[PDB]
Design a protein around this motif. Sequence first.
Motif, mmCIF file in Angstrom:
data_model
loop_
_atom_site.group_PDB
_atom_site.id
_atom_site.type_symbol
_atom_site.label_atom_id
_atom_site.label_comp_id
_atom_site.label_asym_id
_atom_site.label_seq_id
_atom_site.Cartn_x
_atom_site.Cartn_y
_atom_site.Cartn_z
ATOM 1 N N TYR A 68 -22.248 14.155 4.654
ATOM 2 C CA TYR A 68 -23.030 15.542 5.108
ATOM 3 C C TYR A 68 -23.980 15.615 6.059
ATOM 4 N N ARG A 69 -25.110 14.765 5.964
ATOM 5 C CA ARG A 69 -26.201 15.136 6.802
ATOM 6 C C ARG A 69 -25.757 14.737 8.350
ATOM 7 N N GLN A 88 -23.194 17.356 9.414
ATOM 8 C CA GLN A 88 -23.970 18.495 9.848
ATOM 9 C C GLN A 88 -24.408 18.783 11.059
ATOM 10 N N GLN A 128 -27.146 5.541 4.599
ATOM 11 C CA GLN A 128 -27.761 6.561 5.020
ATOM 12 C C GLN A 128 -28.372 6.488 6.539
ATOM 13 N N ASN A 156 -26.854 8.512 9.021
ATOM 14 C CA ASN A 156 -27.081 9.893 8.665
ATOM 15 C C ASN A 156 -28.402 10.458 8.859
ATOM 16 N N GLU A 178 -29.464 13.386 11.149
ATOM 17 C CA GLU A 178 -30.473 14.545 10.899
ATOM 18 C C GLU A 178 -31.802 14.753 11.592
ATOM 19 N N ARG A 207 -40.406 15.888 9.205
ATOM 20 C CA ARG A 207 -39.560 14.714 9.151
ATOM 21 C C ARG A 207 -39.760 13.395 8.466
ATOM 22 N N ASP A 243 -39.656 12.731 4.714
ATOM 23 C CA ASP A 243 -38.097 12.621 4.268
ATOM 24 C C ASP A 243 -37.697 11.353 4.923
ATOM 25 N N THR A 297 -25.564 16.932 0.356
ATOM 26 C CA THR A 297 -26.437 17.957 0.515
ATOM 27 C C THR A 297 -27.280 17.867 1.723
ATOM 28 N N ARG A 298 -28.278 18.788 2.195
ATOM 29 C CA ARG A 298 -29.383 18.631 2.820
ATOM 30 C C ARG A 298 -30.667 18.909 2.315
ATOM 31 N N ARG A 332 -33.918 18.070 1.220
ATOM 32 C CA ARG A 332 -34.740 17.096 1.796
ATOM 33 C C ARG A 332 -34.977 15.818 1.059
ATOM 34 N N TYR A 333 -35.098 14.678 1.733
ATOM 35 C CA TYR A 333 -35.215 13.404 1.062
ATOM 36 C C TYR A 333 -36.106 13.347 0.120
#
Lengths: 427, 421
Positions: free
Chosen positions: B49-50, B53, B302, B305, B309, B336, B339, B391-392, B394-395
């Motif tokens: 997803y990330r 997007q 990730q 990813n 993001e 950022r 996250d 999803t997004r 937040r981490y």
Amino acid sequence: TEGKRVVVIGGGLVGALNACFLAKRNFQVDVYEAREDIRVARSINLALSYRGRQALKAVGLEDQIVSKGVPMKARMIHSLSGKKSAIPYGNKSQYILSISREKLNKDLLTAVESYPNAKVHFGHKLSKCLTMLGPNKVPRDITCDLIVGCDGAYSTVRAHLMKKPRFDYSQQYIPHGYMELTIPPKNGEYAMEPNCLHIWPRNAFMMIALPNMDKSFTCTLFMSFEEFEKLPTHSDVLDFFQKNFPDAIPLMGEQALMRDFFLLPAQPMISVKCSPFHLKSRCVLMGDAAHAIVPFFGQGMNAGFEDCLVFDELMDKFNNDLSVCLPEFSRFRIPDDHAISDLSMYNYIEMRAHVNSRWFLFQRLLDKFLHALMPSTFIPLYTMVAFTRIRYHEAVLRWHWQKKVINRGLFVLGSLVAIGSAYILVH
Amino acid sequence: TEGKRVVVIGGGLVGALNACFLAKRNFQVDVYEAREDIRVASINLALSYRGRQALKAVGLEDQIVSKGVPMKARMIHSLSGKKSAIPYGNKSQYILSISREKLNKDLLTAVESYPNAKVHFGHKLSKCCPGILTMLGPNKVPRDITCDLIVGCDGAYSTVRAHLMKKPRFDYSQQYIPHGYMELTIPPKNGEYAMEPNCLHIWPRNAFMMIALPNMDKSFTCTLFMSFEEFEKLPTHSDVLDFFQKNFPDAIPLMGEQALMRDFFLLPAQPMISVKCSPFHLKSRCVLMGDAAHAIVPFFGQGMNAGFEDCLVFDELMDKFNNDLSVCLPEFSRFRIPDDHAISDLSMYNYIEMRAHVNSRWFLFQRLLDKFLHALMPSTFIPLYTMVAFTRIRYHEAVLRWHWQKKVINRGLFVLGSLVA
Ligand SMILES: Cc1cc2nc3c(=O)[nH]c(=O)nc-3n(C[C@H](O)[C@H](O)[C@H](O)COP(=O)(O)OP(=O)(O)OC[C@H]3O[C@@H](n4cnc5c(N)ncnc54)[C@H](O)[C@@H]3O)c2cc1C
Ligand SMILES: Cc1cc2nc3c(=O)[nH]c(=O)nc-3n(C[C@H](O)[C@H](O)[C@H](O)COP(=O)(O)OP(=O)(O)OC[C@H]3O[C@@H](n4cnc5c(N)ncnc54)[C@H](O)[C@@H]3O)c2cc1C
Ligand SMILES: Cc1cnn(-c2ccc(OCc3ccccc3)c(C(=O)O)c2)c1-c1ccc(Cl)c(F)c1
Ligand SMILES: Cc1cnn(-c2ccc(OCc3ccccc3)c(C(=O)O)c2)c1-c1ccc(Cl)c(F)c1
Ligand SMILES: [Cl-]
Ligand SMILES: [Cl-]
């Protein structure tokens, strides 16, 4: 053997000491020091303890250093109320002592030169390994069987080693900073009890002061760079001090406080960890180059001094085999140098959560209680790090274990009290 | 705005992506890649997803998604031969396998799709400043070059970050973990995929682990993780076979019985390095992204990813704040870093957990348990992998929600457990 050649990067505290130890094995030791000679031309004055003194003693320099330092036989703790409360440093034989950065560095550089087989090359800096001479861009490096990085917390030697493989490294600037303020003599005597570490433990702000020989104290003030932001004005400084450290203003010059505060800005404290400390028997790090710890236990110089000693013990133990000694240094010493780094940080953190006038006292007095109750099984932490050479990581292990048995042992008394109350209350 | 020059150091996954995003708001963007053009001159990874997007944001989702194999489930290879498939949370939600290379090539090409962009292959960097010194095709041709922005996308061992590291108030840490990694290949058998082609295949021994991801020819590429220690103990074909027989017995058929040998001795185990730093910028002239800013250990799929993001979040900020790099550079670091530290941590946690508490079995239990409670309470409990993969959220919030969950479960089921018994 004798006629191998070693270069020491850095003519600091640790650099100098190491060069003594090495000169004393009949090595040819060249010491390269960025600054000009400080006997002709960070902390002002520091706390010297068992570990450092034992290193100093192995070079027959302890007596000289000890003679220029003022003993600190106790803590003296300045409450916000004005209450001065004094707890001794362990047993009667054990005290830490206050010495000067420069007197120490100076005597050590002199001790370096006293060995005819050792030179110290002032005004020489380093770019790769490329040492500079007096004039910059005079690149006239020269080779050696050992390069010892004692170039301090911002280490050039470390910087090369960091690019090598399987080298873990980390560097943290903590939230607080420090700045130096001096208490003078009051009518030519010490304005406070001069054989004491003076502490003003607030939480977000803490002050210590250490006695000098001209009857002064030098004080370092710790607080979050945040609050250094909030006192841009002389009024603010004054207001702050009136709020948090009432008895300083009289002790220090009321007006000189303002010259000395705004004289230059709060200093950052860095913490660097790394592993390992060496590279294939040609290169090794020591002191602040190897570990740079936040100044919250009085042990940065003591530990770096101890590195020098532990090395020298391995050079005895392995008849001067660098291929043995360098990996062994890293194996043996990294645990400890990391553990004191942790202790130091723990302490700094603890000291911002909760150490006030009151807690400091309870914590130490409780420690004193339990030692007196159960020696040897409980020795307080301070005693272990300051007055012995118990390995730092072991001292951490023992200190945790102890806290485990005080917590478990308290629980059963608390619960036996809890059943004892009810049984005597019903019948 | 159009007048501003920017340089992107590195023409990797993040570098090339970012170059697009920047080109697309009319900067003058130059990408400087130390390697030659890989289109003329982790082999394969898990897009989600990330990343998708961010790819979407630049008109390239579809191009990338076309060339990848959907992995709709985990498939877990137990030592006994048993093969349990646990789905990824939902029929819409899958992770997909793509090639590092194909992904990198399409992004290079997309970078060049914009007239205001150039990429400069075989150009390396020496030193920078807030005036930088990039090398030409010929070594020792140190021509200077200037710009309004320098974006460090030069990977886990990042030159640009080496300069930031020297500056004040800059926290940084590097840690090489014990395990290295090695790529092996499961070929096609009789022209078909040798296993279920739409799974992430996992063989979780503890001290040894292995995964496999499908490519579009009918193969899988595997990564093998083990301690560099063990790698040292397998110098001969015999030892590798004898090892494989012990720990990954079904592989020796699956893998070329001696393709394994070609590939294991092809080149040495590569090290995995965690790097963390703060902040990600230097006062409106310079910013780090992707692995330059966060090299995470590759145990949550990730890395790319998050780095993708990063590019998206920068774009969102440049929109919010009308292209003010004085605002966006600090806001990037502010928004950022929490996250990007969180996912770094998640990744490492995962990796430690996979050396103790996942054998064949705990993987199934944990996932199935988690699946049960989502079905029970679809809003108050979302499982971990769903939150990061699909999803997004937040981490750092995902880690919060995750800890919270673990607490309400531990407390709530310790209540059922202790009180009613
Ligand atoms: C506020 C504060 C309070 C402290 N209090 C205490 C205390 O109470 N007790 C205690 O034991 N410790 C204390 N310390 C720790 C102590 O200051 C250090 O641990 C100690 O100085 C380390 O010695 P060193 O030689 O490794 O580093 P330094 O003493 O800093 O020496 C490094 C030397 O290397 C030189 N150098 C640097 N780069 C180069 C180069 N490229 N080429 C050549 N030379 C170079 C420098 O000029 C310098 O002389 C404190 C530290 C601070 C910051
Ligand atoms: C085994 C493994 C498995 C992985 N699996 C996944 C996964 O399943 N899912 C996922 O999302 N992520 C995964 N990752 C993470 C992914 O590989 C990285 O996140 C990604 O490549 C980082 O992108 P980047 O552009 O920042 O770095 P890179 O792709 O490494 O780009 C760096 C580029 O800059 C160039 N460069 C470097 N220095 C200079 C210089 N001084 N001058 C000029 N150019 C320079 C380099 O040649 C290179 O092209 C995995 C990583 C590994 C190791
Ligand atoms: C220079 C120097 C030499 N020793 N110490 C030191 C350090 C910490 C200590 O424990 C504090 C504590 C006691 C009880 C609970 C938490 C913390 C003690 C102690 O036990 O006396 C002594 C310092 C020092 C340096 C900076 C600060 Cl801010 C400070 F307070 C003291
Ligand atoms: C490339 C890629 C994409 N996703 N993942 C991934 C990672 C971790 C996961 O959690 C493990 C776990 C499950 C249950 C309990 C603890 C841990 C899951 C999952 O839940 O399927 C999927 C990987 C990957 C990367 C390296 C290894 Cl070693 C690996 F096994 C898988
Ligand atoms: Cl210190
Ligand atoms: Cl990754």
